[PDB]
Design a protein around this ligand. Structure first.
Ligand SMILES: [N+]
Ligand SMILES: [N+]
Lengths: 99, 99
């Protein structure tokens, strides 16, 4: 048989404009998005924001890192802080679904 | 922009029969499959062998491990030895193309 043991991982490079990165997240320790699951997930992509304009990030993608900040097993508040603490240029590390 | 930084990784579980695993490999330190590339690649899947029957392994797949034996930066001869030294049950770790 065959089964995924880890996901394809993409690095998405964005330039943040006055409209911001324009995506929403859910999940994290203390805000689990599914039972037993601490991952950060992308839940909304806002029209006109950098993520939407670039076109690569997708709802349901798992956010593993922002810049040098690992988001693999962190609280929701820590992920939110990491996103807010971005400059003009942002590197996102995302896991894609394995289906 | 978006670009892959690492591949989806599959674990393929096979039962080796009298016909064997039935696949060929190329690459490794001292047998590089492309310039600057030390990876082990699957080059042939033999009709009727375990890999072909199971259907999941594909020509061009990158073989990262056989059982507990890492093949990430090894000689060609070391990869061949790792494959030959398999029992009935084999775990293959494979990277899939990111396209
Ligand atoms: N994938
Ligand atoms: N993939």
């Amino acid at each position: 048989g065959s089964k995924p043991v880890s996901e394809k991982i993409m690095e998405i490079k964005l330039i943040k404009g006055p409209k911001g990165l324009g995506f929403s997240i859910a999940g994290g320790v203390g805000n689990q998005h599914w039972p037993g699951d601490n991952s950060i997930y992308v839940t909304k992509i806002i029209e006109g924001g950098a993520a939407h304009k670039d076109g690569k990030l997708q709802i349901g993608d798992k956010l593993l890192a922002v810049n040098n900040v690992a988001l693999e097993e962190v609280t929701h508040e820590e992920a939110v802080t990491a996103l807010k603490n971005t400059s003009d240029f942002v590197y996102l590390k995302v896991a894609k679904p394995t289906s």
